[PDB]
Structure 1
Amino acid sequence: SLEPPPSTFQPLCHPLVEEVSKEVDGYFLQHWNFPNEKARKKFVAAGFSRVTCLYFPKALDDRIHFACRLLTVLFLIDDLLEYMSFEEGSAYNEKLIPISRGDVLPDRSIPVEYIIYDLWESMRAHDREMADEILEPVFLFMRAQTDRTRARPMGLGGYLEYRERDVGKELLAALMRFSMGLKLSPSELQRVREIDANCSKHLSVVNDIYSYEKELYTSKILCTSVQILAQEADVTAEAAKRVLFVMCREWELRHQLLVARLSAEGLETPGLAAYVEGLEYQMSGNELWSQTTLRYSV
């Protein structure tokens, strides 16, 4: 089997995982309309708060639950969207956006509506400025949840450049910033643009590596680095995964080189130091998640 190559990175889980997980899991169990009990247990088995804590292990203790709640509902909606047309799905999320902004009252009789409204009111309550910062990154994601993928010739370079702008990864980095109380300035963000793009790729390719078996097992719009590299080099998908994993390690090193350079230049501010560290854990965390999540299972 695969067997990942050596990495100087390692997965870390948020100290309070057990605590938040119980809290968040409990809240959705009492508020979200799960159909049958079977589903009720699929949810707990999922451990969305445990996923969040794996991604943002360095989050502030009094903010990690916000991140867990946001991702939990987002994972939930993503599941429902699967069973509805691009039309209703798009209509479904557009209704939640003004409600998320808090510009429109929720229909207290619809779980998702008041869970979203309450959640964002809570966030603006704890930190208004930062809460309003993640608004667009979230809307961008939600909207993309229903965008139709365009099939076109794509080599490795083009695919990777495309993944560098993944809205999901952007959501993760912006959310991680909220969870960590890192109020980075426009000049600080631009300073780590390469780091972000680099990180974005690592995350997406690691996902491709463990999601391939399922992507193909879809009575198979196949768009993945595994298939692209396998065809370009003319080797098996397994061989492709191997090569790609080494590339990921090269991106891990590039991450260090860029961070090292950032410091030498005297541009590594206190916040940026915390930020790039966070991204390192997203990379190692996303790797563990990919190897274990049932989402990639068959």
Structure 2
Amino acid sequence: LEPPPSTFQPLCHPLVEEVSKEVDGYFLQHWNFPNEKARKKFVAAGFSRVTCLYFPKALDDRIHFACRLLTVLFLIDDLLEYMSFEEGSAYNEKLIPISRGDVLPDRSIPVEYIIYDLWESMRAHDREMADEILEPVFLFMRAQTDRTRARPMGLGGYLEYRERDVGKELLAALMRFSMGLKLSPSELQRVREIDANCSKHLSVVNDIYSYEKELYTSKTAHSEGGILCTSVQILAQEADVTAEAAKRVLFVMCREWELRHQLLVARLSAEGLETPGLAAYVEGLEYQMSGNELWSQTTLRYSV
């Protein structure tokens, strides 16, 4: 699969090697893997590597929090595939009060205490910015088991839903936390078109590379949790082409979204609305798009 040209230059956080060792090591100590094969597969994924590609301008003393959060979320994303919507929702809802810190974790259950300790540590570091990630995470978690996944969707409807399931908002708040980048409500409201555009790119680039993994899952895992929900399948169906053909077409659309990002950024600046905070922010989103692509292309999570 030959990606169409992009003008985006992906960047990776400079501390990626040390932070990946730290965070992978933490999960290898605490998380419950079913066997050694699974432990190796976990390390192969490079969950801290994608985090460092997503947030290359994260502050050095903050990048690890982001790595931990995305790692645990990846792990849960995989667990949900073996559950019904009802079971998955129950699993996720239990972690919400724990994430807030309202409820103590069962220390015999790694997901509970990992989640609890992580969020406590983030609030200890920067309470205001950590709290601003909570609702975006819960919105993502609830989308994961939304019944809409069991209903046919068109492309537009899918992308509207997928903005939640792909965790666009959580990634934005996490990026801001990791960079210590504070924005006003007016600044935030100002870039909503830019956000919505960026989420389609993240979503579809992921869909393109994760399709084979997810097709297999739809055949082998739970009839609800493993359900095939992806732009690749949707376009293949609507246009009556193969999944591989749909990937090639979707990749061209991703590049059109890249062009639109540049246009929207130019226009924000042109109408005198680009603050220094907003400039750092929209550049931040570009790294998310190019980083997501670079990792997705190379990660063993999708290639094997």
| TM-score, shorter chain, exceeding 0.5 | yes
Contact 1:93 1:143 (C-alpha < 8 Å) held by counterparts:
yes
Cα shift readout 1:157-182 (whole Å, capped 9, x = no counterpart): 33334434545222212211111111
Identity %: 100
Q: Which moved more, 1:68-77 or 1:86-95?
A: 86-95
Assess, with a 3 A threshold, how the Cα gap between structure 1 residues 161 and 271 changes in structure 2: closer, same or farther.
same
Query: Are 1:247 and 2:256 matched, yes or no?
Result: no
CA offsets 1:223-272 (integer angstroms, 9 cap, x no match): 43333334444444333322222221111111111111111112111111
1:41 corresponds to:
40
**CA contact 1:165–1:200 (8 Å) conserved in 2:** no
CA 274–79 in structure 1, closer or farther in 2 if over 3 Å, else same: same
2:259 pairs with 1:260: no
Q: 1:108 to 1:208 in 2, by over 3 A?
A: closer
| TM-score using structure 1 length | 0.90
Mapped to 1, the partners of 2:138 and 2:113 lie a distance apart of 17
Change (3 A) 1:89 1:151: closer
Residue 35 of structure 1 aligns to a residue in which SS? coil
Comparing 187-196 with 89-98, which one deviates more in the overlay? Answer: 89-98
185-194 or 99-108, which moves further after superposition?
Answer: 99-108
Contact kept in structure 1, 2:4 and 2:251, CA below 8 Å: yes
Is there any run of 5+ residues in structure 2 with no aligned partner, and where? 220-226
- Cα shift at 1:107: 2.3
Residues 191-235 of structure 1, C-alpha deviations (whole Å, 9 max, x = no match): 100000100111111122223334444566544333333444444
Q: For the residues of structure 2 that align with 1:42 and 1:244, how far apart are their CA atoms?
A: 28
Which is further off, 108-117 or 121-130?
A: 108-117
Q: 1:143 to 1:233 in 2, by over 3 A?
A: closer
Worse-matched range after superposition: 223-232 or 122-131:
223-232
Would the alpha carbon gap of residues 113 and 283 (structure 1) be closer, same or farther in structure 2, given more than 3 Å must change? same
The TM-score with structure 2 as length reference comes to: 0.89
What CA deviation, in whole Å up to 9, does each residue of 1:20-54 have, x standing for no partner?
A: 11111121222223332332222222221112111
Aligned position for 2:295: 289
**Would the alpha carbon gap of residues 44 and 183 (structure 1) be closer, same or farther in structure 2, given more than 3 Å must change?**
same
CA change 1:297–1:147 in 2 (3 A) is: farther
Q: Which residue of 2 aligns with 1:116?
A: 115
